[PDB]
Amino acid sequence: MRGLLVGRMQPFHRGALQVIKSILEEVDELIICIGSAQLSHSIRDPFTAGERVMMLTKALSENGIPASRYYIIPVQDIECNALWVGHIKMLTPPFDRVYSGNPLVQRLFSEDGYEVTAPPYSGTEVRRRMLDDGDWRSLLPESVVEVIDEINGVERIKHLA
Amino acid sequence: MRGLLVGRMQPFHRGALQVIKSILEEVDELIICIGSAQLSHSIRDPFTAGERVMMLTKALSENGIPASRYYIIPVQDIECNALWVGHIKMLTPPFDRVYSGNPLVQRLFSEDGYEVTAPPYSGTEVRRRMLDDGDWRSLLPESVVEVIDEINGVERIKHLA
Amino acid sequence: MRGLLVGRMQPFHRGALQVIKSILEEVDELIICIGSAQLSHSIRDPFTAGERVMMLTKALSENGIPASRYYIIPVQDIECNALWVGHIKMLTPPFDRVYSGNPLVQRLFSEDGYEVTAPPYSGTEVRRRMLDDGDWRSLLPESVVEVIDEINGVERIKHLA
Amino acid sequence: MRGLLVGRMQPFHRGALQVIKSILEEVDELIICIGSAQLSHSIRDPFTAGERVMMLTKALSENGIPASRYYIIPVQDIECNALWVGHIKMLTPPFDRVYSGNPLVQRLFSEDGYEVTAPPYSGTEVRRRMLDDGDWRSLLPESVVEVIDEINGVERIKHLA
Amino acid sequence: MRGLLVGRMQPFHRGALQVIKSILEEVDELIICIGSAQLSHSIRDPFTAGERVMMLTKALSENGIPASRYYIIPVQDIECNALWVGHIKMLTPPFDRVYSGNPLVQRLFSEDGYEVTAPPYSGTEVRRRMLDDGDWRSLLPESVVEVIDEINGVERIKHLA
Amino acid sequence: MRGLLVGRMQPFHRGALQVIKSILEEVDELIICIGSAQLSHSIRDPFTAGERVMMLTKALSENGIPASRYYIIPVQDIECNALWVGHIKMLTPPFDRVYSGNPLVQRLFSEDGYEVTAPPYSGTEVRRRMLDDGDWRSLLPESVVEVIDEINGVERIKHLA
Ligand SMILES: NC(=O)c1ccc[n+]([C@@H]2O[C@H](COP(=O)(O)O)[C@@H](O)[C@H]2O)c1
Ligand SMILES: NC(=O)c1ccc[n+]([C@@H]2O[C@H](COP(=O)(O)O)[C@@H](O)[C@H]2O)c1
Ligand SMILES: NC(=O)c1ccc[n+]([C@@H]2O[C@H](COP(=O)(O)O)[C@@H](O)[C@H]2O)c1
Ligand SMILES: NC(=O)c1ccc[n+]([C@@H]2O[C@H](COP(=O)(O)O)[C@@H](O)[C@H]2O)c1
Ligand SMILES: NC(=O)c1ccc[n+]([C@@H]2O[C@H](COP(=O)(O)O)[C@@H](O)[C@H]2O)c1
Ligand SMILES: NC(=O)c1ccc[n+]([C@@H]2O[C@H](COP(=O)(O)O)[C@@H](O)[C@H]2O)c1
Structure with a gap:
């Protein structure tokens, strides 16, 4: 019984950690795919895979x-949404x-015949506080x-901005 | 103290397992990169990442x-050898x-300033025996x-051949 | 006497059908290229090629x-506008x-030496009505x-939105 | 009842025409995919899509x-065999x-759950005769x-050789 | 003593020329990289490399x-910012x-260990005047x-707009 | 009166230099394109662009x-031969x-309507002598x-081999 979760994790926050724990209550192992593994050094995607x-x-x-309960696999994005599920499978x-709350991810896996569960604290909020000196x-x-x-993450995000 | 090993693992054999164990004697953790993660269903690369x-x-x-002693990370190949090391780093x-015995991998990491150790049973032999009904x-x-x-690996390799 | 028309057809509407008929009055055959053949499952491009x-x-x-009066050829987009006309030709x-009313398409073919005719009901309007339950x-x-x-097109577009 | 046939058609020969006719006896329409649509001007692939x-x-x-009995669709190749079937579907x-006699094509579609029929005069022979002034x-x-x-095909193939 | 400057040069203006001259006062030669060499015929990038x-x-x-004081090298962009510096080096x-005033360029080269100098009249302004019939x-x-x-640059930009 | 020459220059030899001089006798300037700019660290293409x-x-x-008599422009290869000439133009x-003695280059430019002159000492020979300790x-x-x-070129080529 293996589940799959996909997220950019830019950066990995408390909410995502909570969801991972809840997920591990109903499946033996969890594949955690780090989406957009090719993007880094931008406002929306500061960190490398x-x-x-x-x-x-x-x-x-x-x-x-x-560690035996999960797999961490960076996944690059591809231009054709229609092949992304096969990309992940491969x-x-x-x-x-x-498990996903991302409409696109849900729809693609759903059309492929997969059972999609939306999860029961947002990178955007985190990156915004890093930039505005808020409480990130x-x-x-x-x-x-x-x-x-x-890795000097804040220094990086501020210079980029 | 983290080491890095790269290989196609087509398929993962006894020799590679032995080398991984020896490597884990001198480093705390080992990053095991599965090279050519984009290739599958061919004679030289039968299996998906x-x-x-x-x-x-x-x-x-x-x-x-x-499991806490290593990381398994599939890595797609890229056309420009000159950027491959940066690709892996990212x-x-x-x-x-x-750690590598692959001349190209050794040279690229070496030119990048990395300490390259060549390891102290070959996919080719394994795939050849699967095809010729030898002892794989x-x-x-x-x-x-x-x-x-x-996954019906032999059935796949034979049909492809 | 063969003409060429390019469009995303997201989805193919009445206006586009009308234009195709008028075009078929002045040319023997019409090549209908479905542009952005690689995009699907997005708000602007819901359907696969x-x-x-x-x-x-x-x-x-x-x-x-x-059917002998036309050719339906899906065409993927490319990053370099300067090569797109050659891409279509190939x-x-x-x-x-x-025939096109798209400024970019007109300019590219024009610079290439082609005679460009702008056609004598918009995907945007259609997709907006599908989303807002209007009359699409x-x-x-x-x-x-x-x-x-x-193909459950509306169900798809709504979930994506 | 729609079938699918894939081939490079470099160039389209008598044997392929025969097979297409036989196929049209058991299916209503036939999708004829021209594979390797991106390759041209080489010894193995002289002609553009x-x-x-x-x-x-x-x-x-x-x-x-x-014409209503078939669809002609040029299909570019992709690096990952594992996604090629989804590529064709899209x-x-x-x-x-x-329908195919190509082991790779058969295996990929077969693994995807498709019924693959191998067809009941080879581009290689044709191109070899064009080059050696044989009877192509x-x-x-x-x-x-x-x-x-x-299109001056022979002139092209000879100059390339 | 060789410096490196990167810019899209869409189009090359007076300010950029001034900066190039000042730069040539402190280095023997200057490598001038024309960024986004693959983009053309758009509002932000009208001209080909x-x-x-x-x-x-x-x-x-x-x-x-x-001419012996500089090198003009068109450089295509790449998706992964993390490899762009290696891309330029290669x-x-x-x-x-x-030398750069572009935060992203500065940060990437800085993280790579390079000494980045920000230069002591903007393409945007130039292209806006070409479009509005201002004084470009x-x-x-x-x-x-x-x-x-x-090359009929204005005619091109106006038609595209 | 500007000519264009394309070559991999792996490495730039005496013969190529001679041809460049002869070419500069009949044209005012010469564009020297370094082909396969993306390939490096291989037996056939040891050096980066x-x-x-x-x-x-x-x-x-x-x-x-x-220096005012020529332009040095690295050009990456592309998969579609049919667009390569447009790629160079851009x-x-x-x-x-x-000017070229490469059949493929001659045919592509010829089909595009260009006047192709074949030039009146081979990288292969040079790289072979570097490897066999011959007189390169x-x-x-x-x-x-x-x-x-x-740049330690020989050291690189030998390790790769
Ligand atoms: N490459 C694709 O076509 C495609 C389609 C859907 C989702 N994704 C990825 O899934 C991840 C989902 O991320 P979040 O929900 O955290 O935004 C992202 O990295 C996104 O890019 C990729
Ligand atoms: N993509 C590249 O430019 C590049 C350069 C060197 C090695 N590699 C990869 O390293 C791996 C090494 O594999 P093996 O030594 O088992 O053959 C392969 O997957 C190879 O493709 C990739
Ligand atoms: N790939 C390119 O560089 C490029 C340039 C111009 C137009 N196109 C395509 O032409 C089509 C025109 O579509 P519409 O006019 O319906 O929007 C689109 O699919 C567009 O992407 C592609
Ligand atoms: N792009 C891919 O990964 C992939 C996999 C299998 C077959 N194909 C194509 O299928 C076609 C089959 O051609 P033939 O059987 O005539 O050789 C070829 O164009 C081949 O390139 C593509
Ligand atoms: N391809 C990349 O990842 C990447 C990263 C940073 C800058 N660049 C290029 O550097 C150039 C800088 O241009 P300007 O400062 O004039 O805008 C642009 O062409 C930009 O695209 C490329
Ligand atoms: N990318 C392409 O489709 C294509 C077509 C013809 C020639 N080329 C390049 O032209 C250059 C000619 O090199 P040489 O004649 O020295 O081999 C090479 O770099 C070759 O790769 C590229």
Whole structure:
């Protein structure tokens, strides 16, 4: 019983961590696809796929979730939405259910015959607070804040803006 | 102390498993990049990236190596060799040493300033035995043989040939 | 005497059908290129190229226009506008005149030395009525409405929105 | 009842025409996909997709097959074999059976759940005779020979060689 | 001592010429990269890379700057910002300093370890005056105005708009 | 009166230099396109486009040819031969004649309506001597040998082999 979740994780926030835990209550393993793995250094997508892999890895580990319970797979975007589901399939282990609140992701997997569950704190809010010197830290697990400090994430986002 | 190993894993054999174990003796974690993640269904590259993720995952787990000791990241190839190292960096956590016996991989990482260690049983031999009805099973961990049977790998390779 | 018309046909409406008929009065055959053949499942481009081929095919046939009078060729977009005309040429039979009301299409073919005729009811209006439950059906040939019902087009566009 | 046939048609020969006729005995319409639509001016792929569309169009028409019985759709190749079937689907009307003698095409459609029928005179032979001044004309329908003369096909292939 | 400057040059204006001269006071040679070399015929990017090469070439020559003092290299954009610096490196001679006022360009080269100097009259203003019949000519070197007249640049931009 | 020459220049040899000089006797300026600008670090294409720009630049300068007499423009390859000529046009200043001994290049430009002149010492021979420790230096201008030593070209080619 393997589920699949897709998200840009720009950056990985508390809400996403919560949803991952709830998901792990109903499936044995979870494939966590980091979408738009090719985008970085922009206002909407500040971090590279590798940096996000670290954010997810450190955060899940720090929250006690065993590494054997999930797969972290960066997935580049493609121009043709009609092939994106096949694109994901080709890069991942088999899965039974898909979790997403993204209308496009839901519709594509749904048309493909997959059971789509929408999940029961938004990157936008987080990146906006980093830019306006608001309180972004409280919206993220401490392990993630730590990675962002280590890679100079705020310094990057501010210079880009 | 994180190392990086790159290979097509078509399919993941005993020799590669042995090398992974030896590598894990000198580094804390190992990033295992599955190269040519975009190629599948050909004589040289029979399996999709997702199928190889399963082969690696099951095999490492079955050999007792904890999931927290490694990262499995499928990496698509790119046309420009000159950017491939940056391509890998962008998709992965930071690493200190690179392990490879592939001249091209060694040279590219070397020119980039990385310390390249060549590893102390070849996909070609394995795929050739699958095609000629030779003894391919003995060259692979049993968990891998199991995945290949589950996905009808031999049936696929024979029809393609 | 072969003409060429390019359009996204998202979806194929009454106005476009009318223009096609008028065009067929002055040329023997018409090459109908379905532009942006790679885009689907978005607000501006709901339908795949194949679905649009069906919309065009059924509609022209239903309006009595013989199949031998035209060619339906899906054309993917390319990043470089400067090569798009050559792109179209490479995928199509030879043509003498180009019909379009799209400034970009007119300018590109014009710079290439082609005679461009602007045609003597807009996808946008159609898709907006599908979304707002307005009267979209009356803007389209009945064969097209039929295809949209068969492929659940409205259900798709609403979920995406 | 719609079938699908895929081929490079470099150039369209007598054997392929024969197979198309036999296929049209068991299905109402046939989607004829011209594969490798992006390749031209090489020894293995001399002609552009548009030139092949003309070869097919003229030949089928000349052999009395009504235009309403088929669809000619040029299809560009893609790097990932795993997505090629979805690629074809996205560009075409729905189909029930697939006809091919190409192992790769058969395997891909088969894995996708499609019924694949292998067809009951080879481009290679044709192009080899064009190059060695052998008898290529007899291997092709006269309408095709005519198109090749009109576009200077032999002159092209010889200069390239 | 070689510097590097990157810009779209849509079109090459007086301000950019001034900056190039000042730059040539502190470095022996200057690599001038024409960014977005693949974009043309749009409101933001009217001219092809080749047309811009002519604008730069004629203007620098006309202002007395010796050809041996610079390199004009058109550079296509790429999707992954993380590899763009390596992309530039691969296409150019070695350079010691980078000059730019573009935050993204500055940040990318900075993260790569390069010394970035922001330069001590904007394409947007120029293109806006061409469209509104304002005074665009005075914002450009006369050699550039001449190239634009020769290629019918204004006629193009107006038709596109 | 501007001519155009295309070559991979892997590496730039004496014969190519000779041809460039002869060409400069019949045209005012010469556009020298470095083909396959995206390929590097392989047996057939050892050097990056930037390294080749240096080889050409230094060699022409050293042979007394004024920089104002030519343009060095790296050109990436594209999959569709049918668009390659338009690709070159888009990246370059206008030209009147094309010089090449490459059948494909000759045929493509010829079909496009261009006057193609075949030129009145082969990279292959040069790279083979670098690999077999033969006498490669004598086949190249000294400025080129110098660049190769500076970038460790032989060390690279040998490791790759
Ligand atoms: N490449 C595609 O065609 C395509 C289609 C749907 C979703 N996606 C990706 O799914 C991810 C979903 O991200 P979020 O819901 O966090 O925005 C994004 O990275 C998005 O780009 C990709
Ligand atoms: N895309 C590239 O330019 C490039 C350069 C070097 C190696 N690779 C990849 O590294 C992997 C190494 O594989 P093996 O040593 O098992 O063959 C392959 O997947 C290869 O394609 C990619
Ligand atoms: N790929 C390109 O560079 C390019 C240039 C001009 C037009 N087109 C296509 O032409 C079609 C024209 O569509 P409409 O006029 O219906 O919008 C579109 O599909 C558009 O994308 C493509
Ligand atoms: N782009 C792909 O991944 C892919 C996979 C299988 C077949 N094809 C195409 O199918 C066609 C079959 O051609 P023939 O059997 O005549 O060779 C070819 O154009 C081939 O390139 C494409
Ligand atoms: N392709 C990329 O990822 C990327 C990243 C940064 C800048 N660029 C280019 O740098 C150039 C800078 O142009 P300007 O500062 O004149 O706008 C542009 O052509 C821009 O597209 C490219
Ligand atoms: N990208 C293409 O479709 C295409 C077509 C013809 C030639 N070329 C290039 O022209 C150059 C000619 O090189 P040489 O004659 O030295 O081999 C090469 O870089 C070749 O790749 C590119």
